[PDB]
Amino acid sequence: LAKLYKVSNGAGTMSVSLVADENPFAQGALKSEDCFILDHGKDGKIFVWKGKQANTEERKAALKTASDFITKMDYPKQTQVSVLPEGGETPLFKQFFKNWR
Ligand SMILES: [Ca+2]
Numbered sequence: 001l002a003k004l005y006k007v008s009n010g011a012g013t014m015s016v017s018l019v020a021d022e023n024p025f026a027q028g029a030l031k032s033e034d035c036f037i038l039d040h041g042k043d044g045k046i047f048v049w050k051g052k053q054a055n056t057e058e059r060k061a062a063l064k065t066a067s068d069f070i071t072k073m074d075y076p077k078q079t080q081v082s083v084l085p086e087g088g089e090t091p092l093f094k095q096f097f098k099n100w101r
Contacts, residue, residue, distance in 0.1 A: 005038075036062070044075065048063055
């Protein structure tokens with residue numbers, strides 16, 4: 001099962017927190033103020049979703065963390081993080097969500 005993480009410094013430190021571990025995810029789980037990491041790394045699918053109002057530190061932290069997941073969770077070494085902006089989501093990303101519209 002995929003997991004969805006929030007990457008945010010809104011609470012006073014940069015934090016990577018779990019927001020969803022049941023599949024499929026709510027489309028409204030993606031909040032424009034932050035970045036999110038969708039981890040389905042077992043088959044090499046890891047996404048960074050960049051909320052339009054996230055800040056530079058959050059974007060940088062989400063990319064670094066998603067890349068770190070490859071090493072720390074022992075995902076396939078050729079895994080490439082898929083980076084998506086809010087509003088530029090691909091079918092492969094949307095398939096993880098319930099009734100994306
Ligand atoms: Ca934020």
